[PDB]
Amino acid sequence: SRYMDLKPLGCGGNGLVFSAVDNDCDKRVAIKKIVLTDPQSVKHALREIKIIRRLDHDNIVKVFEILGPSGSQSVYIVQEYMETDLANVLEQGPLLEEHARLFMYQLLRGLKYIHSANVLHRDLKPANLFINTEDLVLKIGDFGLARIMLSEGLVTKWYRSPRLLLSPNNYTKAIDMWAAGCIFAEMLTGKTLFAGAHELEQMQLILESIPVVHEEDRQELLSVIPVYIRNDMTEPHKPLTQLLPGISREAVDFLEQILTFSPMDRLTAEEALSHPYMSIY
Numbered sequence: 001s002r003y004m005d006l007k008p009l010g011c012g013g014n015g016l017v018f019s020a021v022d023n024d025c026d027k028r029v030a031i032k033k034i035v036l037t038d039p040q041s042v043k044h045a046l047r048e049i050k051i052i053r054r055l056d057h058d059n060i061v062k063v064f065e066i067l068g069p070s071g072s073q074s075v076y077i078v079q080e081y082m083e084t085d086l087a088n089v090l091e092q093g094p095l096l097e098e099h100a101r102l103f104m105y106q107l108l109r110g111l112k113y114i115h116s117a118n119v120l121h122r123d124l125k126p127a128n129l130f131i132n133t134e135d136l137v138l139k140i141g142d143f144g145l146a147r148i149m150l151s152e153g154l155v156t157k158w159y160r161s162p163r164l165l166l167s168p169n170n171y172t173k174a175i176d177m178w179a180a181g182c183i184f185a186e187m188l189t190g191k192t193l194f195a196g197a198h199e200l201e202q203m204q205l206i207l208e209s210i211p212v213v214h215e216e217d218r219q220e221l222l223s224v225i226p227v228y229i230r231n232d233m234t235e236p237h238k239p240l241t242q243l244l245p246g247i248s249r250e251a252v253d254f255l256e257q258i259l260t261f262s263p264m265d266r267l268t269a270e271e272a273l274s275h276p277y278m279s280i281y
């Protein structure tokens with residue numbers, strides 16, 4: 001009786017999403033319908049709800065209510081309506097460095113929050129970063145959020161870290177950070193940094209630009225891709241400075257610190273925010 005005029009917004013992983021208007025307050029909402037197809041789906045939906053119910057931050061999409069069939073506080077997640085998504089913004093071209101830098105700050109602020117709570121995002125990509133163009137606010141989408149402790153082909157390989165390509169079911173905070181670096185490069189250039197369709201070509205695209213500085217990392221690659229055995233992995237053929245040719249040296253330097261092959265050398269969300277390139281906000 002509360003939510004009226006519902007029009008589908010598209011399809012996520014969990015289910016169909018709809019835009020609707022609330023009667024209590026004349027504001028717009030975004031509702032996710034999750035179908036309880038199998039008992040595996042009910043267990044998955046229940047994990048997701050307990051997480052999003054306790055997270056409250058300026059750069060995380062706000063969850064208002066949870067209702068079942070007929071609307072009572074199939075499952076329906078009522079969240080805040082955002083104007084657009086980052087993917088729709090970047091189809092229109094690259095951003096001014098001032099806007100990319102501001103959106104990166106907000107993305108990092110949102111990551112620093114979820115990571116502190118021992119939550120990570122299993123599906124970080126421009127389509128799941130929501131924008132209100134009026135206030136230039138960026139908010140990370142709730143669906144994909146998971147505690148650190150069918151349709152497989154519909155998962156993008158593009159924002160996957162070298163480690164996630166080698167160990168496909170192991171998600172960590174550092175994996176969110178690699179994806180954030182990739183999204184930042186995409187906001188600056190208006191095109192995907194590493195656009196592979198398969199796990200191996202994605203690894204080969206990364207290896208053309210990212211140095212392998214540890215022998216442990218080098219030995220692992222020689223056991224999967226032995227062609228690079230007499231190549232000095234320390235100096236790639238097409239480095240990030242070449243891949244990003246019109247952007248500032250300050251942006252590339254900050255990027256080189258996030259797009260490290262090893263998670264051990266990679267800045268954390270907290271460290272990236274304390275970086276001079278970000279601390280000015």
Ligand SMILES: COc1ccc(-n2nnc3cnc(N[C@@H]4CCN(c5ccncc5)C4)nc32)cc1
Nearest residue numbers: 009010011012017030079080081082083084085
């Ligand atoms: C594809 O699957 C999905 C998956 C999740 C959503 N979710 N989840 N929480 C949300 C909060 N706000 C919005 N707002 C839309 C962003 C772009 N939408 C338009 C942009 C421009 N024109 C029409 C719609 C509004 N969408 C949300 C939407 C579609």
